[PDB]
Amino acid sequence: QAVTLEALYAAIEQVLRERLPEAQLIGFWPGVPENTPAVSLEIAELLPERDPGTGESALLCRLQARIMVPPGADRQAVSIACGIVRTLREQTWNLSLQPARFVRSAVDGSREELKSLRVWLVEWTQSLRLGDPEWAWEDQPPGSLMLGFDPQTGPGHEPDYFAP
Template sequence: MSEPPISSDEPPVIPSELKQLHDAMTTTLQAELPQFRLIEAYPKLVKEGMKLPALLYAATNFAPGADPGDGRLCLKVTFEALVLLESSRALAPLQAAILASKLMKVLRLQYWEADFVGPTENVQAMPAEFVPELASCVGWSVQWQQDVYLGDVEWPWEDQPPGSLVFAFEPDSGPGSEGQYQAPEAMA
């Protein structure tokens, strides 16, 4: 099986849960934060004339997450968003902080309507570091983490019909004691 090329003028996006997640994030953020004129993941370039206020975001770190034990890979993904607005606005630093707090509210226990992510965790915000290319902007950085489960669930055993699970406790277990086994619902 050949993988699509990673680099070219317009490479195709490799299908992945991460692509689905970013699409869902952009859709949710656009719906919940109409104050932003631009919301974009992985912007190619911050440029003059960009619509402001802007919310630019990306995954910035992957770390191993807790193994779910079902064949999928769990990554603890760190995301970072940059809230930008014109520094010429009245009370621009305060307005940037307010927009960052609105983003934090949207991030509270956010699943992005995806069944392969855990809730957002460790959400925090702070003024963004100065970047010469953004000298005409004021910015706040918002970071959060989220568990993302990649791959398909693998179940190596045949599915069993309901009621096939039974329990026994020593010394009433093993061959010859099958009649003493109990179904979970009988133990309630």
């Protein structure tokens, strides 16, 4: 039903490894610039939005991508950046989300180490309903059923329940 950040972090890694085979290594919090065409996702800032009428928290996250590359492969790193921007026009990442809004792409100066001198910030925002809904007050478990009563249940009561 509703989304989670851990389900969101895996699916952005999932699609970008499928659509981009030239990207050798996709991860949501990597390090260690071991080779040339590396892509390091990040998180910049998560901002509020118009709160819907249930217990959902509306959040737009600046999903930040940093394309680290050693100098001399400047043209080869914009072609990595052009693959991400052409994805983000309609992409909902197969997660019942809104399509992501592309924001910018430019050369920046990182605070981090500059062995890979040229870095390209790619940030985009998409809305999230992370708060648990109040439309339904229960869950849907499959299996066999056990029925108990008021002053006889809890975790310390195994033989109270019945299953005819």
